[PDB]
Ligand binder design. Structure first.
Ligand SMILES: CCCCCCCC/C=C\CCCCCCCC(=O)OC[C@H](O)CO
Ligand SMILES: CCCCCCCC/C=C\CCCCCCCC(=O)OC[C@H](O)CO
Ligand SMILES: *C/C=C(C)/C=C/C=C(C)/C=C/C1=C(C)CCCC1(C)C
Ligand SMILES: CCCCCCCC/C=C\CCCCCCCC(=O)O
Ligand SMILES: CCCCCCCC/C=C\CCCCCCCC(=O)O
Ligand SMILES: CCCCCCCC/C=C\CCCCCCCC(=O)O
Ligand SMILES: CCCCCCCC/C=C\CCCCCCCC(=O)O
Ligand SMILES: CCCCCCCC/C=C\CCCCCCCC(=O)O
Ligand SMILES: CCCCCCCC/C=C\CCCCCCCC(=O)O
Ligand SMILES: [Br-]
Ligand SMILES: [Br-]
Ligand SMILES: [Br-]
Ligand SMILES: [Br-]
Ligand SMILES: [Br-]
Ligand SMILES: [Br-]
Ligand SMILES: [Br-]
Length: 262
């Protein structure tokens, strides 16, 4: 009731497009899961946790997308030419709770391939996860108001954006100060990962603001489209680049299965 999805009836085309976006997302993540599983054997032990974290992200995201898909079809029924709300079973909040889990995994695998270790790894990961959780929690509270109090959505979103900016400053600083440690030419690749991250993660706050500038059924569809683009880019494409960096550094470090795989 606190999300704009509950305010509208949906045409068959809108309803089925959203359903298909979610089910396609399930398939893409679970297909990627198998890929990350199989290639982990070609990653040196020092970096293998990075590929395992991608497996965890894939199944976490895939399970939540699958839950959303079923909740979507549970909540609406085709009545008198449109899909109409029948039950209070759909909200975007499950995405937020999930981010609490997937964002730390995405950040940790970056720090691993940057060759951080020991106290700097633990300390950097701690500040980053705290900043990320602050961002997610304040965003979560904000979107509880996307129907009733747009002013409060904006203020919680400004607080959330402050955490986001500080998080990105930490990430960028560690990347640019440590890329000279990277092997196999991946000092060039990691800079592209950072820019991919900036692009993909910024799509989420744009989706968060849809209720302010497109409060109608097509805005609901656009938000799910943006989430889909952002999810694939921030989790799947990002994970593929992290895995490439892990294998390339594994090979440059003399790990034979990595060398043969490449
Ligand atoms: C606002 C508080 C953030 C300051 C702490 C911090 O960000 O530390 C990052 C450092 O680069 C990691 O060792
Ligand atoms: C809610 C309103 C708040 C509005 C606030 C607007 C400020 C945005 C400016 C920068 C964002 C920081 C993004 C992080 C970019 C990377 C920075 C970095 O990596 O620094 C390089 C380092 O200094 C070299 O070694
Ligand atoms: C796979 C999911 C990812 C990488 C989620 C990332 C989410 C964000 C970067 C969220 C950012 C937000 C803001 C900066 C302000 C508005 C509220 C959020 C939480 C959507
Ligand atoms: C192996 C790689 C492929 C992974 C297989 C994924 C198969 C389908 C996922 C299940 C999607 C079904 C959700 C439908 C829910 C609904 O819309 O009612
Ligand atoms: C079909 C599902 C996945 C097939 C993966 C099994 C292939 C084993 C690869 C091991 C190797 O390359 O030596
Ligand atoms: C309040 C929340 C704080 C959460 C802090 C999280 C701490 C995570 C610390 C680092 C995890 C590293 C574990 C994997 C080791 C990889 C090193 C390697 O195998 O080469
Ligand atoms: C239970 C798991 C959550 C772990 C939280 C620990 C990390 C803390 C990070 C920043 C907290 C930001 C506080 C925002 C809460 C105010 C919203 C409200 O209470 O209405
Ligand atoms: C956590 C950091 C500070 C949170 C400040 C934002 C609180 C907005 C509350 C709006 C209200 O309830 O009237
Ligand atoms: C990220 C979100 C940043 C929020 C930006 C706030 C901008 C001005 C608030 C306008 C207030 C209008 C009240 C309705
Ligand atoms: Br239609
Ligand atoms: Br239509
Ligand atoms: Br190793
Ligand atoms: Br997720
Ligand atoms: Br179905
Ligand atoms: Br490259
Ligand atoms: Br939201």
């Amino acid at each position: 009731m606190k999300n704009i999805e509950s305010l509208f009836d949906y045409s068959a085309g809108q309803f089925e497009f959203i359903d298909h976006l979610l089910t396609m997302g399930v398939g893409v993540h679970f297909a990627a899961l198998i890929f990350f599983l199989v290639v982990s054997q070609f990653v040196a032990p020092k970096y293998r946790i990075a590929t395992a974290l991608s497996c965890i992200v894939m199944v976490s995201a895939g399970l939540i997308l699958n839950s959303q898909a079923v909740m979507w079809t549970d909540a609406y029924a085709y009545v008198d030419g449109s899909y109409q709300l029948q039950d209070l079973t759909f909200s975007n909040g499950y995405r937020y709770v999930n981010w609490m889990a997937t964002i730390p995994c995405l950040l940790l695998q970056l720090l691993i391939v940057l060759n951080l270790k020991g106290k700097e790894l633990f300390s950097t990961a701690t500040w980053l996860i705290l900043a990320a959780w602050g961002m997610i929690i304040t965003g979560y509270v904000g979107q509880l108001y996307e129907v009733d109090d747009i002013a409060q959505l904006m203020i919680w979103g400004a607080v959330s954006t402050a955490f986001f900016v500080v998080m990105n400053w930490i990430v960028g600083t560690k990347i640019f100060k440590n890329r000279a440690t990277m092997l196999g030419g991946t000092d060039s690749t990691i800079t592209k990962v950072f820019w991919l991250m900036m692009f993909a993660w910024t799509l989420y706050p744009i989706a968060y603001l849809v209720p302010a500038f497109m409060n109608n059924a097509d805005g609901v569809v656009l938000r799910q489209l943006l989430f889909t683009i952002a999810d694939i880019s921030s989790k799947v494409i990002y994970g593929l680049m992290i895995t490439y960096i892990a294998i390339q550094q594994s090979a440059a470090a003399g790990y034979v299965p990595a060398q043969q795989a490449l």
